Amino acid sequence: DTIKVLAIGNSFSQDAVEQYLHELGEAEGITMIIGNMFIGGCSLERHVQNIRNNAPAYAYRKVEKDGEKTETRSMTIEKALADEKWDYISVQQASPLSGIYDSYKASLPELVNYIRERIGKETVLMMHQTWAYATNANHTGFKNYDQNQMKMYTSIVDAVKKAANLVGIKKIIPSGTAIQNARTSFIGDHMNRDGYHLDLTIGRYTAACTWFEALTHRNVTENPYSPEGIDPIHKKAAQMAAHNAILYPDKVTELTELK
Numbered sequence: 001d002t003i004k005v006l007a008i009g010n011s012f013s014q015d016a017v018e019q020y021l022h023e024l025g026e027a028e029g030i031t032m033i034i035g036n037m038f039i040g041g042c043s044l045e046r047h048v049q050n051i052r053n054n055a056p057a058y059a060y061r062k063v064e065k066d067g068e069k070t071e072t073r074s075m076t077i078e079k080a081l082a083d084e085k086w087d088y089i090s091v092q093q094a095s096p097l098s099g100i101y102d103s104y105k106a107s108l109p110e111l112v113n114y115i116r117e118r119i120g121k122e123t124v125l126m127m128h129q130t131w132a133y134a135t136n137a138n139h140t141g142f143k144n145y146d147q148n149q150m151k152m153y154t155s156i157v158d159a160v161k162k163a164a165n166l167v168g169i170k171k172i173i174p175s176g177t178a179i180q181n182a183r184t185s186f187i188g189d190h191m192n193r194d195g196y197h198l199d200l201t202i203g204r205y206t207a208a209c210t211w212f213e214a215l216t217h218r219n220v221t222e223n224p225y226s227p228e229g230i231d232p233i234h235k236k237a238a239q240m241a242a243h244n245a246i247l248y249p250d251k252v253t254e255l256t257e258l259k
Contacts, residue, residue, distance in 0.1 A: 002065070003215050005088040006035040006080060008115075010042040012095060012130050014061065015198040016175055020208035020227060022063045027225035030216055034063040037080050043094040044107035051077050051114045081118040088215060089115060090173060092128040093163075095196060096141025098176075099132075099155025104163035112167040126171040126214075129160045129249070131179035131207075137195030149189075153180050157250050171214070174249035178210040179203070181241035185255035187234065201229045202238055209242035219243060233258075 003025065007013035017034050025032040037058045039046065050057050060075040060083075081089075091111060097103040115125060132152035133142050145152035156176050164172055179191050179198070191203045198204045205227055213220045221239045230238070237258045244253035 002031045002033065003088070004033045004084045004086050005090075005211075005215060006037070006084070006086045007090045007092075007128065008037045008047060008077065008080070008111075009090070009092050009128065010039055010094065011197060013090070013092060013128060014038055015204050016128065016173075016207040016211050018061055018063065018069070020205050021211050022067050023225050023227070024208060024212040024220070024223055025216065026067070027223055028216065028218055031065050032063070032215075033065055033084055035080060035083060035086075036061045037075065037077065041094055043097055044091070044104060044111060047077070047091070048107045048110045051111060054078055077114070078118065081115065086119065086123050088124045088126055088171075089119065090126045090128040091115070092130055093159075095130055095133070096139070096144060098130050099145055099152055099159050101159040101162050104159060105166065108163050108167050112169070124171055125169055126173055127160050127164050127169055129156060129172050129174050129176045131176040131191075131198070132156060134192040134195045135189050137192070139196045141196075149183075153252075161250065172249060173211055173214045174245040175207045175210050177249050177252070178206050178242045178245035180252050181244050181255060182206050182238060184252060185237045185241065185258040187237055201227065202234050205230060205235070206238040206241050209239055210245055213242055213246045220246075 007017050013036050017036050022032050054076050056074040056076050058075045060072040062070050132149045135149045193199050209220045221243050
């Protein structure tokens with residue numbers, strides 16, 4: 001089959017969908033057309049500003065059916081929504097605000113209303129639950145969570161759940177939990193490349209594995225794709241972290257077999 005999925009986001013949706021996800025699908029015979037609407041650091045408030053003025057403010061990164069990766073500049077949300085008959089569309093908050101429910105309360109309903117007016121009843125609208133920062137991250141946003149990884153993580157889980165209920169979204173892609181699960185394994189607190197964005201190999205792959213299982217409902221621990229540059233034991237830890245996040249999206253599952 002084919003899965004057409006669009007993320008409305010920023011560098012954190014980029015970390016999940018712009019690489020690995022297509023390969024994961026391809027290895028199971030699933031073709032996937034992936035779009036990512038990117039503005040650096042973009043929050044829900046800024047997405048709402050852009051839908052109010054139909055701003056051509058986004059870089060549109062697409063992974064085509066054959067795996068080619070293209071960018072189109074100066075894109076609007078309206079145009080992105082009409083680019084494919086999307087099976088799935090995600091929205092998310094900027095990481096500094098990702099565990100602050102009131103930031104979703106203020107902007108998410110207007111954004112979601114705008115999208116719902118431009119899709120059919122077969123399209124699934126989703127939240128992308130993003131991840132806490134590394135424990136020693138220097139990112140200024142981390143102060144919102146007392147520079148404590150677990151506090152941040154727990155705040156994100158809670159905010160996203162409540163935000164989904166606010167706007168009537170039922171499906172959440174639990175990337176934050178998958179990252180947090182990976183951090184309990186022998187991998188430890190080595191899932192980031194700059195304290196907040198994901199590690200380019202294992203980090204991004206763990207997020208992609210979570211998206212793969214969320215969209216295809218196939219157990220990613222059985223997926224045959226072997227990414228280059230990730231050794232087999234790390235690959236298996238990534239897959240298990242993602243699969244446990246899908247099963248148990250609201251809490252850390254200790255990867256005790258891999259410690």
